[model samples]
Target chain A: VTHVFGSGTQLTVLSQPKATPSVTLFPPSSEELQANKATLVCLMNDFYPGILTVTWKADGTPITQGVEMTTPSKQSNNKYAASSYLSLTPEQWRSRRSYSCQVMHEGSTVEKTVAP
Target chain B: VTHVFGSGTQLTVLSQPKATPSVTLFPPSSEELQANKATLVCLMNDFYPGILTVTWKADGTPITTTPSKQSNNKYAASSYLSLTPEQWRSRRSYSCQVMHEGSTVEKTVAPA
Candidate 1:
């Protein structure tokens, strides 16, 4: 006699929604530094109204005390969009080593790194 | 006589900062639908403080009147992560969607 083992087919249903947003960094070229002015910009699209966070880090350290701005609104096509800016001195930019932009949604984290 | 047709070399320097934030959608495995409980989550990293916005839509229409939550603080090592959820009937899941992005980064994820 021969015996075979079998199991029922398991169907996975994604009842919860998952939104994968994309990142776009403007001014895709090298930047020149000024005496005491260096600006940075970041934007995000296709986002839902949830717990969202955007942070900036200089030289591997978070810049929480710096000036920050946020705009929670919609577009004509009903899509969500956001923008951020940061300004620092030339010496701060040079000594800062690297800069990073990060966004937090749901329970996941995404980031982009830039160097001077 | 030979003539040079080149005017001059063009070199542009970007004075503005370019911060590209990435978005990741969670609930990757699978989820079970209850009577009136369903949630969606999205995460973004590498962002700078400016004018940030996050919105939700259902079936191609914007859900501007839905409840939302947001936090702007510093984490241990990560840049930023934001999460949102909508509660509805099980059958209504087929007509729900999510949209999350920032000024430099944008992304959209829908259920399959």
Candidate 2:
């Protein structure tokens, strides 16, 4: 015998008023001494309304290049998830400078930093 | 006369025969919730042989998963599970278990 999922349940909460996303920054995937260029990843999860921006900085100085972000994708709970990538030359990464990802959402900023 | 075309060189390493998959789990999408149900996604990538099975459990109770999907080259696959919104909002743990090459990789997600 086989069974199937039935649909249709009534719930009141259509959307949450506002939510601050959980932010995370991942280090470069390859070894620092093994490659000429490396990419870092920043992941954002469980944000409402899908309106946000991400920026990168090196040792508290704003960086203007080698940054890319994906459009927010809808999540199951009416929230959104997105990720950003930063590409850096090996010289910059190996110099022991700190890199940070700053997520801007709903007039608030969440920051994550990593050191060599 | 010499006609040279396609100036660039492309190269890649050999594929591993029995590598473990990197497993990730995703929550339901807006479309899934619109139907008054939730759907979770389990993604397995960078593995070889394409021999794997996916299972679902809610707080350790067994659930079911849809048919697994494979990439064109069979190096990646995804499995999906359906749930009710109440179950999701209840804060119970929903787990995705993958069995591949005598190893089990499990990932879990809850409301956050």
Candidate 3:
């Protein structure tokens, strides 16, 4: 005859490794400026763990003051994204010289520039 | 004795080199969810020229079907900014990712 015991087997499972993040700048085909108003939209894609930041500068000058930033929304592909809005006069846009979009992640940085 | 000619020499000056593009991600502090609504704001800064785009994804799903696009306005600091908003009732905080050329940047922002 055999006796029954309360002992059982234990098992553990491991998860897959995480994927790397990727950022891209999608420039507009053509931009239109009205007096002191213009719009620039930059597209960033292929990110993991979905975290990102967007900063705008004109001719190497910071554009954080008096600027309004919108919250980032999710994409269908499950990535993260966001944007900022700058309001200035037409002369300002023309005299600004240049503008840039900077993206930083995981201690790494990338950038894209556009000239007036 | 010396003779003077009517011809004069001309000189030209060169301009400075252009500045390179730089991207940064400003993560959020804490996020909030309201039933089926959530907002994520990623800050891309220190850019040389103003040309960029923003895309949204949900749970690894694309969500640009009924998306809206806007223009960038000038700033007192002289930089540019733009944004996108999504309408979902799940109230979940997702990752906000960005891409600038071959480099990638990301940050986490929650509802206030």
Candidate 4:
């Protein structure tokens, strides 16, 4: 059933609201170290409406270089997924630089720490 | 230029084999949690040859399930796991493990 009314406004009733996404950070482990260059990936999955932001940081300072993000990738289902990558040196990572990735959606924030 | 030795062996070169993948696990947020239902996701990317296996396990026993589809680029795929509250609240750990090109990758999370 479809309902239409008011000033030619069209709003289709939604069967399911967006499922709050689950966010994951993929950094290697068990020989998960490099001598210099590395990439940390942040994945946001099972979310909907396809609106989100992903950002990276080093020790609370924003990192503006070597980061790549994708337009939300459509799932077989209507839910969407997005990913972000941060590339940096192992020396910087080995120096105990705290790296983090945060994803924002619908006024909520989800974050994960990438380096130990 | 294509190189041929004697009779019929000519070839073009391809770049990069399946360099080990980066896999991430995303569990649904509190706002998304159900009374007795929970969802978990696994995102696999940066690998090649597009062949891999993703599985979920409970308490070291294989539970069947995970994955939406291969990525649009065909180099990535994401998987999923769902549990009833009984399993969601258990003390045992759940795992997401991947097998790619003769190598094994694994990660685990405990119920809360």
Best by TM-score: 4
Top-DockQ candidate index:
4
Residue B107 in candidate 4, Cα distance off native in Å: 6.0
Give the docking tier of candidate 4: incorrect
- Local error of candidate 1 at residue B101 (angstroms): 30
Q: Which candidate wins on lDDT? A: 2
The structural similarity of chain B in model 4 to the true chain B, as TM-score, is: 0.71
What number of clashing residue pairs does each candidate have, in the order they appear?
60, 1, 84, 3
Poorly placed runs, candidate 4 (over 4 Å): A1-43, A64-78, A83-91, A94-97, A104-116, B1-15, B18-45, B65-94, B99-112
Query: Candidate 2, residues B1-112: lDDT per residue as tens digits?
Result: 3655675543435464567776666675443466686656565655665567888888888784112223323355555555687778785788889987789999877664
TM-score for all predictions? Answer: 0.40, 0.46, 0.38, 0.49
Output the worst ten-in-a-row residue range by lDDT, candidate 1 chain A.
Answer: A26-35
lDDT of 1 by residue, A20-82 (tens): 444433211122242244555555656654346888887677887543544545545444556
Worst 10 contiguous positions by lDDT, candidate 4 chain B = B65-74
Note the DockQ of each predicted structure.
0.02, 0.04, 0.02, 0.05
TM-score of 4: 0.49
Q: TM-score of chain B, per candidate?
A: 0.41, 0.69, 0.36, 0.71
Q: Can you tell me the CAPRI class of model 1?
A: incorrect
The true-versus-predicted C-alpha distance at residue B46 of model 2, in Å, is: 18
User: Worst 10-residue stretch by lDDT in candidate 3 chain A?
Assistant: A26-35
Candidate 1 per-residue lDDT, tens place, B1-112, comes to 3755675543434434544444433321122232222333333333332223454544445565221222443210112222232423212332222222223333344443
Interface quality of candidate 1 as DockQ: 0.02
